Amino acid sequence: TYTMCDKTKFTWKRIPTDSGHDTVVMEVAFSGTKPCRIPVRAVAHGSPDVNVAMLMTPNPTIENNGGGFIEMQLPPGDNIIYVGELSHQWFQK
Amino acid sequence: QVQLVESGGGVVQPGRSLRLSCAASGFTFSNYGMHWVRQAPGKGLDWVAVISYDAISKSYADSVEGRFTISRDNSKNTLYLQMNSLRAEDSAVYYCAKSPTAIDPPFDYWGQGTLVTVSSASTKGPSVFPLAPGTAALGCLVKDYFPEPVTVSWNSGALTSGVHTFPAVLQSSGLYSLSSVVTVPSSSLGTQTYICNVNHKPSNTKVDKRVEP
Amino acid sequence: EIVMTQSPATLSVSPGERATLSCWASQSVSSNLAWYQQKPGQAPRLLIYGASTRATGIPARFSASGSGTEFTLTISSLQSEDFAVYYCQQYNNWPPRFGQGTKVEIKRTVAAPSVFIFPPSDEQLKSGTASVVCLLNNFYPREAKVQWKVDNALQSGNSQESVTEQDSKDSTYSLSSTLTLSKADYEKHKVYACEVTHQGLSSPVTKSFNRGE
């Protein structure tokens, strides 16, 4: 029942990083109106219409005090991760 | 330049429905969150609802949840507020407001507002009575009309200095009454004619009234 | 629930002088705090967002600071068009909440009202009601007392008052008071009087007429 967080207000607290457990982890900070559900997706380079982000954290939120951690699995190759308008490249082995 | 134009307001009876709309121009509508805000006569601003740029996210003030529905048409650049089960306390000027981002406040641009009056009263034009006069004063009593608003000019607008048109009062009868006055030189009463032009657009009531010493 | 409290309710400032308005939140809203200006009869206009950032087109004499639970809007040199109702709005948490507003009016010298009394017209008397109108013209400050007297007996419960917005030319207020009687009650009495207490009058001023003179 939360609204989707304003896509213009995210920044990297931790850019996408190898977790050690065959997943990608990251943390965003959010400067807008809370609480809200984080819009997160990923694409493989050249394929902008097909989301490839498989979330281990399926319902990531920014609570009034807390939230921002995201864990996902990505398919091999060049990918782009988007949290709102915020992006980062990820090359997956 | 960014432009927001509301319509759909008027008189509606308690329990019934009303749809407001807001035509947007001058910006890429589908990139921005949109909000509705309301203001009862003489009172503060009151957030009503939000819809995100892509219509996926919606949120409502407690006072209207379950009764109001916000929506938008991004191809027609239009915002909507469907208001069901209207109560007297929903009466207000309703503003649409644009977000500078995807859904959050603040409200960077505002429409002009549309007046919503929830009431069982019947639309009625005013009686207009004269208020007859160094300095003299004279005027018009604009009594027993519904709904707001009424406009009043003097000498068809060729007289504005010294004019005061007062806020209307709601009387016990559910009807409004206002007065409009002007102070003129007493030496003018013998030669200059004074006429107040009252316009009650809700009832198509246009009344000119000569004020005689 | 986040409660937004503005202070003070009303602020009188001489032109060219400084005005300082406060906004308190019941808990922290970080920097997600906006200020709006609304002039009478117009939609609000965004002045400040992000607690301290001036919106597009806002003159440099508007500045704002604060964060957490305490915020301040300052107008360093108050100009004629800066006189309005100012609202804060927190948007750190859903639902966004407006403060109740601070009115900023012009301070000027004391001006006593000019008082005028108007009997009911014969046109209105045909209708079986009588309205008696008392005008208090161009006074300052806003606080004023009207007392109706019918054959020297003080009335209550049968009058309604209305006040104009501050005049942009001379910064005064005007007030209209209507005493409403039935035609029968009106014709039972002779002396109708309007008694006015105001800071600019060294003693109360009475305007009266005799029914039928």
Numbering used by the authors:
A (entry chain E): 303 to 395
B (entry chain H): 1 to 52, 52A, 53 to 82, 82A, 82B, 82C, 83 to 100, 100A, ...
C (entry chain L): 1 to 213
Tell me, in the authors' exact words, what the paper reports:
Like other flaviviruses, the tick-borne encephalitis virus (TBEV) envelope protein (E) is composed of three structural domains. Mouse monoclonal antibodies against EDIII, an Ig-like domain that mediates host cell attachment, are potent neutralizers of TBEV. To gain insights into the mechanism of neutralization by human anti-TBEV antibodies, we solved crystal structures of the antigen-binding fragment (Fab) from the broad and potent antibody T025 (IGVH3–30/IGVK3–15) in complex with the EDIII domains of all three subtypes of TBEV. The broad and potent anti-TBEV antibody T025 recognizes a lateral ridge epitope on EDIII that is also targeted by antibodies raised against other flaviviruses.
Crystal structures of T025 Fab in complex with TBEVFE EDIII and TBEVSi EDIII were similar to the T025-TBEVWE EDIII structure (root-mean-square deviations [RMSDs] = 0.54 Å for 518 Cα atoms and 0.26 Å for 525 Cα atoms, respectively), consistent with 100% sequence conservation between these three strains of virus in the EDIII epitope residues. 59 antibodies (46 from convalescent and 13 from vaccinated donors) were cloned, recombinantly expressed, and tested in ELISA for binding to EDIII proteins corresponding to all three TBEV subtypes: Western European (TBEVWE), Far Eastern (TBEVFE), and Siberian (TBEVSi). All but 1 of the 59 antibodies bound to all three EDIIIs with similar half-maximal effective concentrations (EC50) ranging from 0.2 to 12 ng/ml.
